[PDB]
Structure formats: C-alpha cells, structure tokens
Design a protein around this ligand. Structure first.
Ligand SMILES: *[C@@H]1O[C@H](CO)[C@@H](O[C@@H]2O[C@H](CO)[C@@H](O)[C@H](O)[C@H]2NC(C)=O)[C@H](O)[C@H]1NC(C)=O
Ligand SMILES: OC[C@@H]1O[C@@H](OC[C@@H]2O[C@@H](O)[C@H](O)[C@H]2O)[C@H](O)[C@H]1O
Ligand SMILES: OC[C@@H]1O[C@@H](OC[C@@H]2O[C@@H](O)[C@H](O)[C@H]2O)[C@H](O)[C@H]1O
Length: 482
C-alpha cells in the first residue's frame, strides 16, 4: 500500500496526490511529472519503473543529457486531474515572463528511495506551481487533511513556502481563505520555539504555530533533512504533526480549536492547490518538495501514523549533487573559458566584479592571483564547493541579483547559500559546469566577459540561450598563483 491507499482505507481519500519521486498509489503506473530541456524545448514524461514504484530517473538523465531541464508539470496520481503547472501572477508578480513564477530545475534535489535514484523539486525564491481549478478539494468549512515530505534544511523567512488549500483567484481574499502546510522560519506572523524552521498552517493573513496569533511554544523547530509535515483542518479544529520522514513517529505540535479570531471559524477555503508560494502568489520563499497529498475528510491520527511509517519505509536518502571533474578542498585552481573565440581567457575579477580576462605567464602577480581560486568545502552544502579569492582571502564568489561578485564571507546563511556551487560534467563536454546550489537552474556563465548566475534562457539579457552550453563549460587547470 502507498500513502493514498492507507488514506482510502481510513475513509479520507486523496483528492490530489503529487510526487516526482514515487507513486503514491500501489497500482499507479502513469506519468509522475513532465520535463522540458532548454536544448529544443521538447518535453517528455517520467513514470514509475513499475506500478507503485520509484521514478525512472535514468530517463530524465537520458533526456536532459548535455542540456538543462525544468519540471513543467507534477501530475496528480489521484485521477482528479489536479496536476500542478506553472504558477500565475496574483497579488504579486513572479520573476518569470508576464508575471509567472519560475519552474524549478529537475536536478536540484537528487535523492534515492530505498537505493533507487530519483529527483525532488528544489524550489528557489520566485518558483511556484499551482492549480486554481481543482476537483474534490475541500471548500467552505469542509474537513481535509494533507502531508508533504520536505527538506528540513532548505528554506528561508520570506513568505511563503506552502503546499495546501488556497484561493482560486490567486489573491488574498481574507482570513480563512486558506489551509496549506508551511515550513520556514518567517516570523512576520506566527512562529515557534527555537531558531526554526517550523511547520505552520497558512490560514490566510496568518501562519499559525498554534492557537494564539504570533508566538506559540508548542510548535518546535523541526530541521531534519527529510521532514514529514501532516496538517488537517475541520469544523473549529485543526492540527500540526511533524516527524523525521527518515525514521520514527509523527509528533503532535498542535491539536484543537481554530485560532479564536474573526474569519477563521467557520473556514472559507476556496479549493485551489499551491506549492512553494503563498495564496496571493508571494514568491520569496524556498524549499524542497518530494511527495505530498491532500485529502477529503479529517484523517484519524492512526491513518497518519501509517502514512508516516510507509514514508520511513520509502527510505529517503540524500543523493549525489556532483558529477564531472570536481575538486578537493584546499585545491587552488584556474578556470578557463571554452567558448570558441574566448579560449584564452580565465575567470578572474577586478575588485568585486567577476569577469573573464586574458591571463598568461607575462601577466602580473596581481592578475595571476585574481585569476586563481582556492576551492573550499561548499559553504552551504558539504557535497559542493565555494570559491575563495587567492588575492583577496576571506572573500568568495557569490551571486547577487544573479551577478557573480567577489564579496567577503559575512558568516550568514544568505552569503553561504549565494556562494555554494555544485560541479556538473560540462554541458559542452569540456571541463565542468558550475551549477548554483540555491538556484539549480543557474550556472556560472560568461556574457560579454562578465560572470553571471545564468539560466539557459530567461528574463535577463545574460540568460541568453545563444552559446549557453559553451558559456557554462570551464576547464579546470593549474592555478596561475602557483
Ligand atoms: C531565519 O534564520 C536565519 C538563520 O539563523 C536568520 O538569519 C541571520 O539573519 C540576521 C538578520 O539578517 C543576521 O544578523 C545574522 O547574522 C544571520 N545569521 C545567520 C546564521 O544567517 C534570520 O534572521 C531568521 N529570520 C527571522 C525572521 O527570524
Ligand atoms: O542572486 C539573487 C539574489 O540577489 C540578492 O538579493 C536581492 C534582493 O531580492 C529582492 O527582495 C530585492 O530585489 C533585493 O533587495 C541575494 O543576495 C541573492 O541571493
Ligand atoms: O562573454 C563573451 C560572449 O559574450 C556573449 O556574446 C556577445 C555577442 O557576440 C557578438 O555577436 C557581439 O559582439 C555580441 O552581441 C556570449 O554569450 C559570450 O560567449
């Protein structure tokens, strides 16, 4: 039995079921999600290896070979057709074309379910999926239950990383017009004990960590690499239950009556489905979606313990983020451009500007240093790396407004995440392709001799698809700074 089988057995069936990693029903064998490579814009679907099995990753790898990929659709295994597509603009606009949010990369969250490779949905700020016209999802004050397996170590405080019930107009229509899971350390509304993140319930104009608006000590900081967030709501009653999806039971952080404030009882849920964003399209949050569902009816604590147990069984385990050459901490390297007509330039810098210059043995000591980088363990992820200036120690290469700059490490989380880059076998085949970690859709890329955290096609002029593969492939060579 898969999650939704258990939910069916409990008389609280799924009305929406999403996951890019595995089937949620034992008998499901259809398409899980859809891909689309930047090479030719053509698509393809990835399904389970076998009925109710894990996703056929190799197929995604085959399809995305020597190019970039995005997840265009996360199908609803339930049959209701509540697939999740690119989120539209609402109370806020997305960073993508005409106000849309960004589709996520297909390789930003590689994992293995019981030894089998699969891909999660790594969402950077500005990314979001939605379905404003679902079927079967609770509305009005109707009871419902939901859950999700997220990455307890990927998130922020910006509004809002959700997965649940939202408004069908993509606008904030007031309190009680939402019921979605939330995971982050935002404190603009509710919040819990510790530094976070916290599993909270977005009920519109308020993320709730418990009964009282604002602070609630009953909701603890939950930060496992694989978190199971279970949330349910009914007639003047709801609850927050969390657990290490990798192992163990669900714990109850909240159980009781609706927060005692106008508009929260009875509820006024509209029935749309959102992911990685807020009900009015707030898109400043980040997270990782592995699998999750919504249901009709208030699930019994028992029913949920079964789902959790099944999850633990799925055996989630972080997957390799690196491919290609790769480096070793403490290694001093020099990165050479492979694009035809620029093959004698190296990634260097002029103060905080990271660019490409012509460096050779006649070059000054200063430039050989500005063109030499010390590779240290990824500031935000030990699997990957961060690049430190040889000439300017204490500073690393980080993206800002998507421009590679040379700033000093200020010890913060932001800096850490903006300075982490993961090695991938060069798209053109020559060397490595340095993929951002916090923005898996972006790679080190030179555009008119200046470095950017560019995507294969986008809203920035430097996101150009023209010469992309070459502009993101670099050869690792001996550091000029010896
Ligand atoms: C959410 O958690 C992060 C990480 O602990 C907090 O970030 C720090 O941010 C402040 C405000 O900029 C800096 O003084 C600290 O130096 C940062 N520390 C780290 C470790 O990054 C963030 O403030 C938290 N958000 C809220 C709303 O409380
Ligand atoms: O690389 C992208 C990103 O740029 C920096 O933030 C800019 C910030 O984001 C919006 O709220 C506003 O446009 C601006 O204040 C981050 O350092 C980096 O991750
Ligand atoms: O970074 C070097 C180079 O810049 C970008 O293209 C520049 C383009 O080429 C000629 O047609 C003109 O000089 C200019 O519009 C590429 O992305 C990159 O390889």
């Amino acid at each position: 039995m898969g999650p939704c089988d258990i939910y069916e057995a409990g008389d609280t069936p799924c009305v929406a079921a999403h996951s890019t990693t595995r089937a949620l029903y034992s008998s499901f064998s259809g398409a899980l999600y859809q891909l689309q490579r930047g090479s030719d814009d053509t698509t393809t679907t990835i399904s389970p290896l076998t009925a109710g099995g894990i996703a056929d990753a190799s197929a995604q790898d085959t399809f995305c070979a020597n190019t970039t990929c995005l997840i265009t659709i996360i199908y609803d295994q339930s049959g209701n057709g509540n697939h999740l597509t690119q989120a539209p603009p609402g109370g806020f606009d997305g960073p993508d074309t005409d106000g849309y949010d960004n589709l996520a990369s297909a390789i930003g969250a590689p994992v293995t379910l019981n030894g089998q490779k699969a891909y999660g949905v790594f969402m950077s700020p500005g990314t979001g999926y939605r379905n404003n016209e679902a079927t079967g999802t609770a509305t009005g004050d109707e009871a419902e239950g939901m859950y999700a397996v997220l990455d307890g170590t990927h998130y922020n405080d910006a509004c809002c990383f959700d997965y649940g019930n939202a408004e069908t107009s993509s606008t904030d229509t007031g309190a009680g017009h939402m019921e979605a899971i939330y995971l982050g350390n935002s404190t603009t509304w509710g919040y819990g004990a510790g530094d976070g993140p916290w599993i909270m319930v977005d009920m519109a104009n308020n993320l709730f960590s418990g009964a009282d608006e604002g602070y609630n000590s009953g909701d603890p900081s939950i930060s496992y690499r694989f978190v199971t967030a279970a949330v349910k709501g009914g007639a003047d009653k709801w609850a927050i239950r969390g657990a290490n999806a990798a192992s163990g039971s669900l714990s109850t952080y909240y159980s009781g009556a609706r927060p005692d404030y106008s508009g929260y009882n009875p509820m006024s849920k509209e029935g749309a489905i959102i992911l990685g964003i807020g009900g009015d399209n707030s898109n400043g949050a980040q997270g990782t979606f592995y699998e999750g569902v919504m249901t009709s009816g208030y699930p019994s604590d028992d029913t949920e313990n079964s789902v959790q147990e099944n999850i633990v069984a799925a055996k989630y385990v972080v997957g390799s983020l690196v491919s290609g050459p790769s480096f070793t901490s403490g290694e001093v390297v020099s990165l050479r451009v492979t694009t035809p007509g620029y093959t004698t330039r190296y990634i260097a810098h002029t103060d905080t500007t990271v660019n490409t210059q012509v460096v050779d043995d006649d070059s000054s000591t200063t430039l050989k240093e500005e063109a030499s980088w010390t590779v240290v363990t990824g500031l935000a992820n030990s699997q990957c790396f961060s690049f430190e200036s040889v000439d300017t120690p204490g500073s690393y290469i980080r993206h800002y407004n998507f421009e590679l700059l040379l700033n000093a490490n200020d010890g913060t989380k932001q800096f850490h995440e903006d300075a982490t880059f993961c090695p991938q076998a060069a798209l053109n085949g020559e060397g490595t392709s340095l993929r951002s970690w916090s923005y898996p859709t972006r790679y080190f890329r030179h555009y008119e001799n200046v470095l950017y955290a560019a995507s294969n096609g986008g809203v920035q002029t430097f996101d150009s698809k023209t010469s992309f593969n070459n502009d993101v492939s670099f050869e690792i060579e001996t550091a000029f700074a010896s």
